[PDB]
């Protein structure tokens, strides 16, 4: 039958009908009479629509061939011959522009004169039944319907026929051409009734070929095919198989509970080796401040001018000389770098306006100090294979180092009060609710407690230094840059003040990965002689740069004044995390506020004021040789703030591992102290897990010592 559509109809219509065939997903080889019927429907749609044009009037202009002009409007514009999505697109667009009603089924054409749709259907059966059939299929329709049938008859409601009658003679001539051409073909044994509305399909997902063999190799050891295994599974029913293997399984497979008593836990062993060194990016306990007493705010001002003005406030400069060498570098380079920094600072002082940011010369001194041109050149393996020295990067456990007493004193003095306010908080919306007033009062109390704390000063120092370093690295990637360490505080009298700890020289910072390292050299003034705790300054070079006179009742001290100079490095991640050190304030004060709220849930009243003023209640916050010492809530605030600050400063994988594996043991010990009969399956394994995190970090070793002390004081 398909030979007929090969022969007669034009290409355009046959591929339109083929795409309509693909539309609903049925195959053309099984039933083709539908293809012919609907392609004839589509053909009558065209032949009825084309050759029919309109101009600004009604009364369509009919031309056998559209002449070249702007007057190519089509009388009837076709609906079908398009995908369902576009057919409904045209339906909705016509409804929204023509203000007509939206039909629920697919029309075939639209006309302007009568501003409505045409649903053309030419069926094998006579018209006077198919018409009202499709009419009762369509609900309350104003779209006019018109149908032909092979006998040659026409019909329509309203007795309406919308265009010329010679066109309809055309239609029925086409119709009988179709008819008495099948006459030569002979199809009416099924042509009248060949489609009955079949819609059914079964989804087929068959495993075959290579993928089947893979299925045959992904079974238990004693199975040969997926078919057999699935049959076995379907036939499988529970018949007490877990019990049999449990009985047969060796009894050494057990989870015996070892009781956890007061005498069970042993102190954590600390590693032994050379004392632990300093790792901070700046001096914390041995910092010195040169000040100007200016009225500018933290960010307000220009760095270089402030630094120069602060440094001019000090008199007593001496020619620098080596006091304590780096022990691994070239100290003369550090000396020359310091003198170069001074010289270029003067050079800025001379000229017209202090630059906002200064670049330094790339001398051999800072070329060595900043580690320039030291990365091995990257080459290909095929060119370097016979080199005996060629091997992997050194990948082994870090060097072992024992704890020293300097970190303990540094933390002790990091929780001490100061003679300045190191936090100038921002603005918030004016409090409107009583709860907001309570929150503001609490916040004011904590700010009064923690602002005068060395932890806040360290927070500001780190934030400013890391912000400046990151910005300089991102801006001046190539050229070495000078950045004075600046921090602005407010005195007890209320006068604002600036403080200059020293200088940082940032080097080449072409940082691609988050782990890539930018090297800088840090110089900081101090008065602490490095000849008393040399092991804490393994990586520092310390010079003697001047003498300071601070008013004291013992005449006047006239102390020496040294310069701690070192080469340090950071990374994008480290800079970003060090510039978010202000969340240590959060951590600490959230803990304290949780304490206050928990206690106030007992007594139905806010308990902040008496906690902060009466200072009757105290918490164990340290141990003295006499015994455990307790301090007021403010001291707890400062201690927790210092702990968070040191966590942010000495952060490392060792800290995370020890924290987790020691929190586990802390929970076990707490369960013991709560009389909850705690038990363990392998306590030695937990101990070994904790002890492997303690390698060389001073902070984690101090935490381990604190944990041992807590165990000793606990378990009683």
């Amino acid at each position, epitope marked *: 039958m398909e030979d007929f559509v090969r022969q007669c109809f034009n290409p355009m219509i046959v591929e339109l009908a083929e795409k309509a065939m693909k539309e609903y997903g049925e195959d053309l080889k099984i039933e083709t009479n539908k293809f012919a019927a609907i392609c004839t429907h589509l053909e009558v749609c065209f032949m009825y629509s084309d050759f029919h044009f309109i101009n600004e009037r009604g009364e369509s202009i009919i031309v056998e061939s559209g002449d070249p002009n702007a007057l190519l409007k089509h009388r009837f514009e076709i609906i079908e011959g398009r995908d369902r999505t576009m057919a409904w697109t045209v339906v909705n667009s016509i409804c929204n522009t023509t203000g007509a009603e939206k039909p629920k089924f697919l029309p075939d054409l639209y006309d302007y004169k009568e501003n409505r749709f045409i649903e053309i259907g030419v069926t094998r059966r006579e018209v006077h039944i198919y018409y009202l059939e499709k009419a009762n299929k369509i609900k309350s329709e104003k779209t006019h319907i018109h149908i032909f049938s092979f006998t040659g008859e026409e019909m329509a409601t309203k007795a309406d026929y919308t265009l010329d009658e010679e066109s309809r003679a055309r239609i029925k001539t086409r119709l009988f051409t179709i008819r008495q051409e099948m006459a030569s073909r002979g199809l009416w044994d099924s042509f009248r009734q060949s489609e009955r509305g079949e819609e059914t399909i079964e989804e087929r997902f068959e495993i075959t070929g290579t993928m089947r063999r893979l299925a045959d190799q992904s079974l238990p050891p004693n199975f040969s095919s997926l078919e057999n295994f699935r049959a076995y599974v379907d036939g499988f029913e529970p018949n007490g198989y877990i019990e049999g293997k449990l009985s047969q399984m060796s009894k050494e497979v057990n989870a015996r509970i070892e009781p956890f008593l007061k005498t069970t836990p042993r102190p954590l062993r600390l590693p032994d080796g050379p004392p632990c060194s300093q790792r901070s990016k700046f001096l914390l306990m041995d910092a010195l401040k040169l000040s100007i007493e200016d009225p500018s705010h933290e960010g307000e001002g220009i760095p270089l001018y402030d630094a120069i003005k602060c440094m001019r406030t000090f008199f007593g400069w001496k020619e620098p000389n080596v006091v304590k060498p780096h022990e691994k570098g070239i100290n003369p380079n550090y000396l020359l770098a310091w003198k170069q920094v001074l010289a270029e600072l003067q050079d800025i002082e001379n000229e017209e306006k202090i630059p906002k940011t200064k670049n330094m010369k790339k001398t051999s001194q800072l070329k060595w100090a900043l580690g320039e041109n030291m990365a091995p050149e990257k080459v290909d393996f095929d060119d370097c294979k016979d080199v005996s020295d060629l091997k992997q990067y050194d990948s082994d456990e870090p060097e072992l180092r024992s704890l020293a007493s300097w970190i303990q004193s540094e933390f002790n003095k990091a929780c001490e009060l100061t003679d300045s306010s190191w936090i100038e908080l921002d603005e918030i919306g004016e409090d409107v609710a009583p709860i907001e007033h309570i929150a503001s009062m609490r916040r004011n109390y904590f700010t009064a407690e923690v602002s005068h704390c060395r932890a806040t000063e360290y927070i500001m120092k780190g934030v400013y230094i890391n912000t400046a370093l990151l910005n300089a690295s991102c801006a001046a990637m190539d050229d070495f840059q000078l950045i004075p360490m600046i921090s602005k505080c407010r005195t007890k009298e209320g006068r604002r003040k600036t403080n200059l700890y020293g200088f940082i020289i940032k080097g080449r910072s072409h940082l691609r990965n988050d782990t890539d390292v930018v090297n800088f050299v840090s110089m900081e003034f101090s008065l602490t002689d490095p000849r008393l705790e040399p092991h804490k300054w393994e990586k520092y070079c310390v010079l003697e740069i001047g003498d300071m006179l601070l008013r004291s009742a013992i005449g006047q001290v006239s102390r020496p004044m040294f310069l701690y100079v070192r080469t340090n490095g950071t990374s994008k991640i480290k800079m970003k995390w060090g510039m978010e050190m202000r969340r240590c304030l959060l951590q600490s004060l959230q803990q304290i506020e949780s304490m206050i709220e928990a206690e106030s849930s007992v007594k139905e009243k806010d308990m902040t004021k008496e906690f902060f003023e009466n200072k*009757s209640e*105290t918490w*164990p916050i340290g141990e003295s040789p006499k*015994g*455990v*010492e*307790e301090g007021s809530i403010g001291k707890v605030c400062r201690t927790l703030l210092a702990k968070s600050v040191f966590n942010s400063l000495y952060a490392s994988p060792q800290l995370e591992g020890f924290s987790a594996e020691s929190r586990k043991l802390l929970l076990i010990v707490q369960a013991l102290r709560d009389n909850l009969e705690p038990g363990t399956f392998d306590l030695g394994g937990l101990y070994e897990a904790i002890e492997e995190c303690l390698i060389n970090d001073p902070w984690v070793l101090l935490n381990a010592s604190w944990f041992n002390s807590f165990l000793t*004081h606990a378990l*009683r």
Partner: nanobody
Amino acid sequence: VQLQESGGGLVQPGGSLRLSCAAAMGWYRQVPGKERELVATNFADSARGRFTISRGNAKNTVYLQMNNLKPEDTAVYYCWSTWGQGTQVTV
């Protein structure tokens, strides 16, 4: 932790008394007309120089050695770690 205080009683003014508590530790007191008062853990102003706190970690005992007692020391003296029931001191 359970706590039992011993060593209270009736005493002369200017007399001496050794409190002991069988079990950081300390001593607080409660006069009939008031709430808790800190004695020792560090000593309060009202009792400093007169009174001494000590402990024997091998005996599990904290001691309060009271000397040159005043009528104003008359209170129930409570030990703590957890609170004892208190021992009556009357001067």
